[PDB]
Design a protein around this ligand. Structure first.
Ligand code: GDD
Length: 361
């Protein structure tokens, strides 16, 4: 097979959809298939040669050309579009292409927004999606009620072994014990304010605790906020994946205090693959990943009080952790690429057949 993929976000900047597309392309290639990945200009990163630029948003006429040239010349057995919102590179591809088309819907909020977007004026285009992949059972039931046609649930994958066998960072694990936070910390939905609010309760318990923070942000604004406790924060910046795996394995707890805007809990999955106990915010999607509290500890949503007690309980009580890490290590196989690439392939195969290529409208 020849798979064309579309990613609507730049690879300039880490993110769930980007990381999915790149990782999925590599896996399909490891498996013999040809992949071509289309994405917005990504000036800043070393991308493999099968990543193809769609030009940069400001999208203009050259991008509409480029999408059409790519499709028409690509000879693709399957076009796999991710997050086809409107507008976006993805929706541009969906409008330009005819034939074996598969889409993965990474984000969702509600039944309401799913019915209306799928039943809306973009309906003609959504009806061209032959294989629909959703990342939860609910999102899925939402698209089946919207368009009256089968969708499938496939959780996004990870490389479970690349976390598992990550080397610990210099001088880790820590005596004063360490907690990991990973994300664009100055978006409130990512919940840094909660972990901030619980920090005093934490520090009183482990005077030598380190809050190890991965991701881009205003370090100053947060430092000044942590007031007295700013010394306990250690910022890796926006680090590479090898380092992030290392950081994850070398932490004692992974904390996901998000407030919402999360359709799938992938960082959680990453912490489970590393063997770091997870403590998490209890958004519908996080509950699914921690399987109702059997594979990680869940905490009410905007509650720094509960969050402290939670991390405190996990850190001091070894047996409990061991059990979380054991139970979660077992469950995390469900998310590994070998499982998930299979599920996607079956979708690619339902949708394709000898002689049928993707074509320009
Ligand atoms: N190397 C590296 N990886 C990062 C960094 N920041 C994020 N990542 C990786 O980026 C991916 C996405 O995680 P987020 O940054 O938290 O999520 P998002 O892009 O803001 O949102 C999407 O992903 C969530 C994860 O499933 C979804 O819940 C959400 O709905 C959306 O689909 C994860 O694999 C995470 O490890 C970083 O600084 N460095």
């Amino acid at each position: 097979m020849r798979i064309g993929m579309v990613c609507p976000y730049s690879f300039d900047v880490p993110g769930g959809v980007q990381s999915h597309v790149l990782q999925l392309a590599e896996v399909l290639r490891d498996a013999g298939h040809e992949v071509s990945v289309l994405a917005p200009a990504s000036p800043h990163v070393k991308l493999p040669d099968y990543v193809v630029s769609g030009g940069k948003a400001v999208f203009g006429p050259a991008t509409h050309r480029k999408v059409k040239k790519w499709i028409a010349e690509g000879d693709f057995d399957v076009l796999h579009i991710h997050e086809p919102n409107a507008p976006s590179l993805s929706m541009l591809a969906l409008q330009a292409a005819e034939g074996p088309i598969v889409a993965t819907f990474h984000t969702s909020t509600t039944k309401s927004l799913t019915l209306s977007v799928f039943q809306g004026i973009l309906r003609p285009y959504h009806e061209k999606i032959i294989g629909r992949i959703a990342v939860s059972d609910l999102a899925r039931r939402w698209q089946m009620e919207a368009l009256g046609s089968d969708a499938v649930e496939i959780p996004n994958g990870v490389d479970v072994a690349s976390f598992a066998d990550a080397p610990l960072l210099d001088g880790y694990p820590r005596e004063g014990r360490t907690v990991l936070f990973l994300g664009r910390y100055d978006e409130p939905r990512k919940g840094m304010a909660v972990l901030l609010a619980a920090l005093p309760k934490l520090v009183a318990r482990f005077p030598d605790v380190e809050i190890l923070i991965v991701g881009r942000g205003d370090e100053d604004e947060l430092r000044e906020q942590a007031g007295d406790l700013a010394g306990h924060l250690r910022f890796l910046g926006q680090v590479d994946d090898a380092t992030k795996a290392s950081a994850m394995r070398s932490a004692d707890v992974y904390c996901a205090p998000h407030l919402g805007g999360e359709s799938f809990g992938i960082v959680l999955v990453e912490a489970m693959a590393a063997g770091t106990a997870v403590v998490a915010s209890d958004l519908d999607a996080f509950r699914r990943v921690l399987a109702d509290g059997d594979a990680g500890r869940l905490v009410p949503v905007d509650d720094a009080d509960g969050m402290a007690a939670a991390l405190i309980g996990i850190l001091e009580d070894d047996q409990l952790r061991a059990g979380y890490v054991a139970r979660a290590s077992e469950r995390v196989h469900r998310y590994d690429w070998s499982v998930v690439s299979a599920q996607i392939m079956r979708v690619y195969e339902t949708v394709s057949g000898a002689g049928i290529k993707v074509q320009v409208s």
